[PDB]
Amino acid sequence: QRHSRLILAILAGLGSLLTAYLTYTKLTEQPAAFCTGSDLVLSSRWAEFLGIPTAAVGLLGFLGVLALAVLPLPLVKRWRWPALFGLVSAMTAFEMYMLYLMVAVLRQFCMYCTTAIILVAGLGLVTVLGHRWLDGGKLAFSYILVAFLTLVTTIGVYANQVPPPSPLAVGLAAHLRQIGGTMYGAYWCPHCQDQKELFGAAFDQVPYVECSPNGPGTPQAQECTEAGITSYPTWIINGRTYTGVRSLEALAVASGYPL
């Protein structure tokens, strides 16, 4: 109701728990190549960061705030209320990029993902509202520092996630072009993107049939059903149908390209 850091502690609970959940989800997942048709944006790319699940990155942060909201008072007097600023600010930086992706690049809504953000959104709004240097503008800057320092790392670490496209990719793309080799799949599907990852620069050459232009759970485009496509990144290469992400390695086998 008024001036209370316990309100942080609570929101850190919910943050922690939800975050712990999706961690246990991605960790227990039974992996797949096709994605015929819990959530898709949730097990997109990005959801895995630096080794650990992004949920886990979320975890470290969320219980990291919980502890500081609760651990005080000797051992760390001066340091806890700003350390509690630096972590929440850094979470806000990360929230914004996730939110960005969600809205802008993935274009799909994820209700676990929105929750997490709303939670952090709140984690700031409360953390903002302490006595806070008789309201200094040192925040304004301090925030802009930490926010921006994070968005160079986060955006950095995500762009360094995708590996430099294989040497094979260039030829295998322009070959599949020749021998009619076609990839049927949905733009939304994490794996139709997974396959598109492996080719990279080269993918612009690869014969691609988009199957579901208008989102998930809406009629699959006509070209696809006529070729009997039932899952999402299937390959029709010379009468033979490969149902699932294949390596550049294995597509070169299936397509006659000498590896």
Ligand X SMILES: COC1=C(OC)C(=O)C(C/C=C(\C)CC/C=C(\C)CC/C=C(\C)CC/C=C(\C)CC/C=C(\C)CC/C=C(\C)CC/C=C(\C)CC/C=C(\C)CC/C=C(\C)CCC=C(C)C)=C(C)C1=O
Which partner, ligand X, Hg ion, none, binds residue 192 by CB below 5 to 8 Å per kind? Hg ion
CB 203 within 8 A of CB 172: no
Question: Closest distance between ligand X and the C-beta of residue 85, in Å?
Answer: 12
Residue 100 is labelled as binding a ligand: yes
Q: Please, what is the Cα angle at 118 between 112 and 120, to 5 degrees?
A: 105
Task: List the one residue from 11, 12, 91, 211 that touches ligand X (CB under 6 A).
Answer: 91
Binding range to ligand X, per CB under 6 A, among 53-61, 127-135, 222-230, 232-240? 53-61
**Which residue of 106, 173, 186, 252 would you call a contact of ligand X, by CB under 6 A?**
106
CB of 227 to Hg ion, least distance (A): 16
- Assess 46 for contact with ligand X (CB under 6 A): yes
Segment 142 to 201, residues that bind ligand X, using CB under 6 A: 150, 153-154
Task: Residue 175: name its binding partner from Hg ion, ligand X, none (Cβ under 5 to 8 Å by kind).
Answer: Hg ion
Q: Which is nearer to ligand X, 20 or 221 (CB)?
A: 20
Residues 6+ apart with CB under 8 A from 122: 11
Contacted entry of Hg ion, ligand X, none for residue 66, CB cut-off 5 to 8 Å set by kind: none
Q: SS3 for 241?
A: strand
76-103 CB burial, b ≥16 within 10 A, e <16: eeeebbeebbbbbbbbbbbbbbbbebbe
Distance of closest approach, residue 100 Cβ to ligand X, in angstroms: 8
CA distance 197 to 205: 13
Q: What is the DSSP letter of 110?
A: -
As a 3-state breakdown, the chain gives helix, strand, coil percent values, each rounded to 5, of 60, 5, 35
Q: Near ligand X by CB under 6 A, which window of 1-9, 89-97, 161-169, 191-199? A: 89-97
Closest of 66, 85, 56 to residue 10, by C-alpha: 66
Tokens representing 221 are: 């485009």
- For residue 217, give the 3-state DSSP assignment: coil
Tokens matching residue 90: 């850094």
Number of residues forming the site for ligand X (CB under 6 A): 29
Instruction: For the beta carbon of residue 132, count every other beta carbon within 10 angstroms.
Output: 14
- Given the rule CB under 5 A, which of 108-116, 181-189, 214-222, 247-255 is the region that contacts Hg ion? 181-189
CA-based nearest residue to 189, from 237, 165, 156, 224:
224
User: Which residues inside 159-178 make contact with Hg ion, applying CB under 5 A?
Assistant: 175
- The yes or no reply on residue 192 touching Hg ion (CB under 5 A) is yes
Can you give the binding site for Hg ion, defined by CB under 5 A? Answer: 175, 185, 192, 196
Q: Which residues are annotated as a binding site for a quinone?
A: 41-47, 91-102
Can you give the binding site for ligand X, defined by CB under 6 A? Answer: 19, 22, 41-42, 44, 46-47, 54-55, 57-58, 61-62, 87, 90-91, 94-95, 98, 101-102, 106, 110, 113, 116, 120, 150, 153-154
